[PDB]
Amino acid sequence: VVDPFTRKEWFDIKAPSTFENRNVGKTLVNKSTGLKSASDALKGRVVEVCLADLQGSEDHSFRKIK
């Protein structure tokens, strides 16, 4: 048994100011350490999220925003 999920940092994801409520969700990553750090493994993430999630209105249930 290793359980690699007890060793990640659980970050948080925001949105740009050109939106409504900007709390998208969390992100499970790694504990950043030395020897090939896991801090820059969070620089290139890409998140697909629906516009109705980012606006609160179901009129944009389509148009998923990346």
Partner: protein
């Protein structure tokens, strides 16, 4: 209020994948397939194998922090069937039955334009 993951049910024929990732898709949480629950080799794609696989995914989705999922249904796609397998419905239903909340169910079967040559030949698979 709710911590959201991505469910990503790959429902082909011959198998069924329930691959919950993080919201960005890069980090994997409890990929459990239908062949991991039954050992008969002809019911890997069966609804019973998919429902057991989905509830084992929800067993690890809890005790890591995931309380809700965005469901992405996947058939084989490409030059293949484009129709979801028999286990996608059981896997999706078992996720709801297990307490994990659902949101924005979407079909993400890879759909080409016209494309490379589908396998089988001119006269197709004739049995």
């Amino acid at each position: 209020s709710q911590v959201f993951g991505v469910a990503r049910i790959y429902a082909s024929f011959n198998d069924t994948f329930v691959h919950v990732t993080d919201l960005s898709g890069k980090e994997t949480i409890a990929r459990v397939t239908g062949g991991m629950k039954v050992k008969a080799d002809r019911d890997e794609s069966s609804p019973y194998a998919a429902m057991l696989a989905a509830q084992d995914v929800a067993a690890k989705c809890k005790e890591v922090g995931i309380t809700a999922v965005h469901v992405k249904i996947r058939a084989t796609g490409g030059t293949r069937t484009k129709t979801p397998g028999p286990g996608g419905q059981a896997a999706l239903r078992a996720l709801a039955r297990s307490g994990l909340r659902i949101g924005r169910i979407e079909d993400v079967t890879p759909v080409p334009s016209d494309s490379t040559r589908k396998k089988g030949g001119r006269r197709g698979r004739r049995l």
